From a paper:
Attempts to obtain crystals of hRpn13 Pru with XL44 were only successful when ubiquitin was also included in the mixture, yielding a structure of hRpn13 Pru:ubiquitin:XL44 solved to 2.1 Å resolution. Each asymmetric unit of the crystal contained two molecules of the hRpn13 Pru:ubiquitin:XL44 complex. As expected, XL44 was found to bind to a similar region as XL5, tethered at Cys88 by a covalent bond between this amino acid’s sulfur atom and carbon 13 (C13) of XL44 (insert). The electron density for XL44 was well resolved for the methoxybenzamide, central benzene and indolin-2-one rings, as was the thioester bond between C13 of XL44 and hRpn13 Cys88 and the surrounding region, allowing stereo assignment of the two chiral centers at C12 and C13 to R and S respectively (insert). Analysis of XL44 binding indicated that the XL44 indolin-2-one ring interacts with hRpn13 Met31, Val85, and Phe106; the XL44 central benzene ring interacts with hRpn13 Pro89; and the XL44 methoxybenzamide ring interacts at opposite sides with hRpn13 Trp108 and Pro40. Except for the backbone atoms of Gly35 and Thr36, the hRpn13 β1 - β2 hairpin spanning Leu33 - Val38 was poorly defined. The XL44 methoxybenzamide group buried into an hRpn13 hydrophobic pocket formed by hRpn13 Pro40, Lys42, Val93 and Trp108, similar to hRpn2 Pro944 and Pro945. Superposition of the hRpn13 Pru complexed structures shows translational movements of 4.2, 5.9, and 8.4 Å for the β1 - β2 hairpin upon binding XL5, XL44 and hRpn2 relative to apo state, respectively. The positioning of the hRpn13 β1 - β2 hairpin is more similar to the hRpn2-bound state for XL44 compared to XL5 and allows interaction with Trp108 as well as closer contacts with Leu33 and Phe106. The XL44 indolin-2-one ring is buried within a pocked formed by hRpn13 Leu33, Val38, Val85, Gln87, Cys88, Val93, Val95 and Phe106.
Residue numbers in the entry:
A (entry chain A), B (entry chain B): 21 to 133
C (entry chain D), D (entry chain C): 1 to 72
The structure:
Amino acid sequence: KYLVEFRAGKMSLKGTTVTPDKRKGLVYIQQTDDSLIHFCWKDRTSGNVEDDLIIFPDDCEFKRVPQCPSGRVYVLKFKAGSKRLFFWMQEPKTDQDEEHCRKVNEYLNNPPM
Amino acid sequence: KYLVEFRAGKMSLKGTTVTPDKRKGLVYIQQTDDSLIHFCWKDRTSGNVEDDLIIFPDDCEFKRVPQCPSGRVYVLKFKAGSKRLFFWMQEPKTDQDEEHCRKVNEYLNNPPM
Amino acid sequence: MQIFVKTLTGKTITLEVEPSDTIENVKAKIQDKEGIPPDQQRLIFAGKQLEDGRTLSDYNIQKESTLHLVLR
Amino acid sequence: MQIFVKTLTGKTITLEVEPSDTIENVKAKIQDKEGIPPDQQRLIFAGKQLEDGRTLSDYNIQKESTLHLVLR
Ligand SMILES: *[C@H](c1cccc(NC(=O)c2ccc(OC)cc2)c1)[C@H]1C(=O)Nc2ccc(F)cc21
Ligand SMILES: *[C@H](c1cccc(NC(=O)c2ccc(OC)cc2)c1)[C@H]1C(=O)Nc2ccc(F)cc21
C-alpha cells in the first residue's frame, strides 16, 4: 500500500508561461521491499506511473509555491541541483493540503521504521 | 592539531558595496574530543578565534565565488538557510587553493575515521 | 510546523513545533518523545548551539528544517 | 573533482573523479576503493538510477555532489 497519497495534477513553467497538465493524477509515496522510498505520480484514469523517483533524506523538500495565487501549487525541490517538479492539488477539500505536504516531507526525509 | 588550515581573510557584501577585512587570518577545521567538527577563523596577529561553527554532513558547501574578479574569494554556504561566510585567500601561492577547498568540503561533509 | 532532529549515532526524530517555541520548549518536546532529559541536550542549527531562552523563529528555523542533537 | 557516495549502512565514501568519467568508471573506482563489484552497484542521483554509459556531467553531477549507492 501507499504510505502517503493525494490527488494532484502536474504542471510546467515554460520559462515565462505556466503550463498546467489537466489530467487527473495521484501523488504517492511507496516503500519497496528493498526499503527504498519512491516518490511517484500516476494518471488516475489510465493507472500509468509517469514519475518514480528514489528519494533519500536530505535530497528533497516538498513545499507550497507562494507566488501561485491558487494556493494549491506545490513543488518537489531537489536541494542540490535545479530539478523541480510542480504539482497542483486536486483533492476536493483543502483542509488537508498542509498535512499532505508535511507527510510527504516526513516519509522522504525521515521514513519511520 | 588542525585537520586542515590555510591563510585567508574575511569579507562582507554590504549589499552593493564589497568590504574586505584587511586582517591576516587563518581558516582551519578542528575535531574536538566529542568528535564534533569545527570550522574556525582566527586572527593570526592576535590569535583570537572569531568564528567557530559546529558543522555536520549536508550542512555546508565550501566553494569559489566565480563572480569575484580576484579568483581567490570563497564562500562557506549553508545549504538550508541564507547564512554565508566569505573569505579571500592569503596563501602566498595559489596552486593549493582548489585543494584547500576540496579538503574543507571533505572534513565538513565526510570526516574520515 | 514540522522539524527534524538528527542525532550523532542514532535515528532522526520528527517533531511538530511552533515558530514561537523556545529552545527550552523544544528540548521538553524531545524529552516527551524520546525520554532524553533537557539538561543533556545540545541543539545545533547552522553551525551554532541554540540558547534556551530564544525561539525557533529567532534562529530562522522554518518548516521542515533539520536540527542536530548532541548528547552531553 | 570530489564527490561523496552514501550507502545504506551509512558509511560515506569520498571519491576523486572527472566530469567526463562514465558511471561505469565511477563504479570501477568504488571497486578499487571499497572492493564492491560494479555489477552489484546501483548509483542514484536526484531521484534517478544512473546509466553506465553516461557521464557525471550528463547528470549535472558537480564538485562536491553526493551520490547514493545501493547494493543489489
Ligand atoms: C505560479 C502561478 C502563477 C500564475 C498562475 C498559475 N497557475 C496555476 O495556479 C494554475 C492554473 C490552472 C490550473 O488548473 C487548470 C492549475 C494551476 C501559477 C507560478 C510560480 O510562481 N511558480 C510556478 C512554478 C510552476 C508553475 F507551474 C507555476 C508557477
Ligand atoms: C565579488 C567581488 C567583486 C568586486 C571586488 C571584490 N573584492 C575583492 O575580491 C577583494 C578586494 C580586495 C581584497 O583585499 C583587501 C580582497 C578581496 C569582490 C563579489 C561577488 O560577486 N560576490 C561576492 C560575495 C561576497 C563578497 F565579499 C564579494 C563578492
